[model samples]
Target: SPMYSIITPNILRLESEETMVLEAHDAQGDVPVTVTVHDFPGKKLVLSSEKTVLTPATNHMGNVTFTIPANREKGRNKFVTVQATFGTQVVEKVVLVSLQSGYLFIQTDKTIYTPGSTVLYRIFTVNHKLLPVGRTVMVNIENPEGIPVKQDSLSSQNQLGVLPLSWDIPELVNMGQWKIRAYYENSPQQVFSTEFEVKEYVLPSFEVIVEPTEKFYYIYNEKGLEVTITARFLYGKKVEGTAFVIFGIQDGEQRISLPESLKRIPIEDGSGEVVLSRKVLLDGVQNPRAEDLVGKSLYVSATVILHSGSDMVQAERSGIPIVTSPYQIHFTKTPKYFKPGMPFDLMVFVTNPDGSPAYRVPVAVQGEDTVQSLTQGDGVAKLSINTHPSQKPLSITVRTKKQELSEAEQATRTMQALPYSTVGNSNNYLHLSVLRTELRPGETLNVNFLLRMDRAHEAKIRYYTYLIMNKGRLLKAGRQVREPGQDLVVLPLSITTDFIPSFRLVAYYTLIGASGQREVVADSVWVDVKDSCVGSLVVKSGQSEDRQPVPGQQMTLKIEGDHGARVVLVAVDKGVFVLNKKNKLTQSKIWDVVEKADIGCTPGSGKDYAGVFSDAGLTFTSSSGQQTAQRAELQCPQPAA
Candidate 1:
């Protein structure tokens, strides 16, 4: 007989719950075996049984099955034991039983979260795939000290496959590490665990004070007085925070802080300064008096805070004061508008109600639509407007600050003076000055050339004009005069010509810079002439009327010019002709004309004749050059009385 081996659930011990299945085996055939289970640490019997026969019908492949009862105790280890006997031979095996083990995972809302923020935690059973399905698991959380967490569960509602819990750390949690754990149901052992830290926070702190040296603050009629706020931390320490300061009329017991809608200078280095000026409309209305806010108090608050771990701490302070003698604004001069490509002078009159100049006052002028510059000298500031080709109408603004004046310094000083001007054309196409020109045969007719110079800067350049014809002929060509180093030049030209039938004319010009180099820079229309002539004629007699032949006349026809000239002659039956001097007439068999007539003359002859004449209009008689019979009378008839 062999010993019986037992496999029990919950055999391993880890931070998480673990489970083990029980398996029993016996080598002897049909041996009787008994299984027993007991609690760990106490060895108390949990489940005991005997009289279990291990027969072939009840055993599976030499192994027997026995399960540790469900609903096992948690936080305590249970053990399974099996025994078998055959003919006085006894064997036994035992293993500890355990509930399922699992782990707890914590996921934060942010890698770094503010103090008192909520975080989610998840719990999963270790080796859950081996655990029986539909088993309830438990999750727990604690601080670094191992104290139970009361805030929230690590798991969320309606979550399955894994348990979830959420924790909203209180501000008191401060910044420190915390631990989360997951345990099996009915068990005290920690299955899975993770750690997280909380952050600490601090408040913002700052201060504001006024300059006390100036006895009198001069608030301009149109501009308000500037108020400066200087914030300091202990020993020049940098404190990060924001401050909101407002100024308005003082109200009664209500002490309402008036809202000052003016723009303030941004504060860097944990300190900020703002200039508060009374609002003055174009109609010359000044900011209202502080008394209007009788029941309201202007509030200035600065909050300082710093984040440490998961916590936020804040510090704040505020103050109020009664305002007096609000500034008044006066428009001594009107703003001007500028146009593109135009130059203008801007004149801003800085004066008091007495029509006196405002002296030594700092002024700012901004172009509304173009680039402008301000020049200040001798109690007046001048704004120069230089508009570019792409510029548009600008609305310029002028600003000034008032100064404290002694009784002797009461004279008026002009703050700014500017007049608007433009430099370039406003039309879009006007700037299309010629850059280069080309000439094509039968396409370009004439070119009008012009020379231009930038008047502001004297410069010279030379440009050339050319006339082209369709038959590859250059009719006329010339160079145009221009200022040296001139950027833009325009040359106007006039051309006249009679129409030549079946011909073409192209006029063009080369624009050469004053460097004496020529370039075909401009061209004109192409003039093409079509053929316009037609004529025809016919001969009345057998020969031309200018050279007539009488009846029975005998004469020899001899060619005088070179035969190379294409010529053809249709001789009458009685006519005899010959070709000499290489001017023989070509023959055509279809026309029944004799082949090339090359007889009867020297190579170069002053006079040549074909043959002697007899009657019958010059007939050939025999191959031996014998005379032929006369066929017509040669006697001239007597004139009638």
Candidate 2:
């Protein structure tokens, strides 16, 4: 008997409307062949009527081809079994067919690479069913013109069930889109292909220029300066788009770039300006010389980027020139302080670069409290100052204006108390005061008034004084004769009224000097008085067997009064204590204490005494203590005559 071995397993992937072929071979010679076609899972006969015998003319090389059924259910696997017999020998083999569906994906890194850069490609079998293994997969790469550049097999990492391959192209290849195709040996008719873009590389260019046609720059100890730059595209004309400005400095031998921390203000005319009027410490670059900065300047570099369709183009410019002076402005004799209501002279002296007077330069001084004089001979300007009563610190700016120049060299100095004279004045006349004690109805209330004169220069020395009673009435109105030069005065007022609730006492004053006699200053304070009162007491008439109040007898008591009122109660024998002529009962002193109770009187059923009192008078009563007191009470005194 000869040995029988199964060879490679072939796989055919077909679309819904396509056909597939399965082929098998046997090593045994002139054998009786029994070919069986069964569905997967060993169920159902797919091709049972096929030929089963093999002779020299029937099985020439022991090879056979079977046509897959057209009506085969989609996604169902059909297994073809081949049984070959040479006399008493036999061999068996199998082939699988899969329905191919869904998309094929291909990926690559940068289809376009710079001269020395590398390119990589990847292939993936996306959304497809499984097939038999042990198959060789190959991929081909073509240039932009569809000509094959190289061919390679799927690497080990990407050759599990599907083929994923990559290839590198030589640097000499032109930059353009590239196409890649991937296929398998067992299924050579099924192929997948995709394309990616490549781009050419380019470098950036830069230029710089200066303003005013000046050849040098300087830093003065006074005044401010401005530097402007205009950026244009050097590639073509002017790269039209958004641009960024970057600055740098040179310190010793090292060049330090400055951060453009300032916000970019849009320029209506396509130009940006930086103020260099004052000295600033630049990072990295420092104290650069004229020669070192003539071509390599200490300024900002402007970069303009223009968007041309989907591509970006950038250009930059640098090396602008700046000019500065050595001479600085200094104030020699600035005023230290000035008193209010008094005139003082302020003098400022200007000097040249060598500390000498910069002669014949027109100087000007401006401030809140200032009056200037004509310029004297050499670098000197004088100004007269008058301080207001509420004089604040003065900010005086002095500058030297050269005849017919666009800018001035200036210096600013500050002085204290230049406009204010003193603390007491009519302009500072706002005041407040409170009375010492509470007021009462039908009583004389004494109130003292204090005056604060803010601006004394505008206040009159004589004025009438009056107290405003309630909101409508006026009481104790009179006039006070003022002595010359006296600014403030205190007045005492006595008001008599019979009003119930307390009233606000206001002190009113009228100006009596030159300008007007109208009301100028008024101050008010509130006065609270002790007013209404409510008090009550109840008692039971029954007694216990031994003469004490009975447990069944009930009583109640209540009281209400003003803040400072008090109440007291005195007990007496029921027969001995009788109402007196004034309707006030004279009882034995048993707790004659004033009731320092709150707003609402105490309410309960208890045997005790109760009373209510104001700052002027008092009310009291005695009651029979009982758990349930009734038919017992106290009386209030008659009105005072």
Candidate 3:
């Protein structure tokens, strides 16, 4: 059953900024989605809807606004959620909150105009969320000589919180590159500016021809990267003699002022093949972090100044995007042929460009149905699907996340719930306590969680908490309504001393509203379990459904062990994991492993060892390329097959 989708606003923002749009839909009709919320400041979050019974129609969609309490403090604000049960299944959507603002964007109608023309545009004040009320704005047009040419008034009387306006071009305006500048008076030190041309009625010297080898420029490899700028004459062929180019990545916020330069393009074969190197293009970032050169999406511009009759005329064009982030996806479990109508245990690992887990990364799995989940620090996310019968190869793609847009984005696309990204700083807040991190095998562990405004809640309130291992688990899941001022909840865990394994025990909890409404915000933490893997190393494999290799048929490798195979680590690189499993896998693919499970044993009390049979990983190689294990030994995960 496809759960109804829910769209939401931002999860994180300033102290008094909080609003969300909750929506849902279904073909079965009579959909009842209980929407509710609670804030960290003990202020009640709001929600209202109509229809069947706190419900809407089959194609149901409603807007619910959530506002933050004016009387709020700094540091981690909490939004609790309820275990919502729909006509189908329950969905989990988490929103990470913070106290800050984001970037603003502006869009204009035309970048080129004649003497007696009209200029129009729309502006979006983004960051944290849309611009707040009473925020003043200043807009003006400047000519090449730094003179004010025109201006317009702005407002957000419409949806999208956009401010639109227009200005008339003067008949006597200068024939050169002009700029539109906007200033946000009530917020951050941010300004938006763009350039346009006042096309003069004349046979200009030459036209600017801009071209880039890569439309989507990846900053990962800039060692020998460059762009092209060609100078074309009115009748076509390249411009002769002298032509210099000036370039910059258009980042108004990041680069308060674009530091441009004059560079000569390579002229050859009766044409100019102007080239701009990565070093020169990225120099405008001012301060480069991790040497990745500036930011993510870039709107680059290159202006070519031609000395025609000794008059420097400007000709320009914009670059597509300067992409950053080495986000890749590979299957931990791969199969020769992905058959139809069969369910397979699906798992994949995401890595940053530098080969580390893409933490808080957003992963989408499309097959018979779409499944999404957030990855851990290990950079691994758990997902599954039953493949529908297919002809061509069915595929999926993974995108490196901007931040913790995890659960929020996931619940949304599924039409289940709204999503929000990342955590923020807060004072005097909630905390999760895991009694012991290094527990010997077969030893039980203790854990506790606490959340409140300043101290504990003043009355009994409803809350939810559950413990999970690295592979993933739901140890304790229930809705609790404790008296206000109530501060703590303690729970125990089941452990093992067998061989050895590594996984973080994560716990999540949140408070609920009276009669059972939950909040939007929630928090969780992980504790890596320490084990004495001095035990004996033993391994085995089950037979696949097929005899061996069947070109059109799919097979499986069954794994089972008595030592509580709580989780299994397999890979091409930090391999993938099978979590909270006592034994047996009905359906799962295998990424052909080409490496052995190579791990060292520790000097222990009984000579029992951990990471010993880490398999380092079972090796599998396809005709395309050779693959190594994911972890160093107990570290790399395998790639997608």
The residue ranges of model 2 lying beyond 4 angstroms of the native Cα positions read: 1-103, 130-135, 155-165, 202-240, 243-641
**Top-TM-score structure, candidate number:** 3
lDDT agreement with native, every candidate: 0.34, 0.38, 0.41
Write down the lDDT that model 1 would get. Answer: 0.34
Ranking by lDDT: 3, 2, 1
Kindly report which residue stretches of model 1 are placed more than 4 angstroms away from their true locations once superposed: 1-34, 38-60, 70-80, 85-90, 97-106, 126-159, 200-641
Cα error, residue 501 of model 1, in Å, equals: 99
Ranking by TM-score: 3, 1, 2
Model 1, backbone clash pairs (residues 3+ apart or across chains), number:
123
| Per-residue lDDT of model 3, residues 302-412, tens digit only | 444444454233545443445443365655422222223333333456765334566777666434224567776666665545555443354554433345434322221
The weakest ten consecutive residues by lDDT in model 3 span 602-611
Provide backbone clash counts, one per model. Answer: 123, 43, 73
Error of 1 at 430 (Å): 99
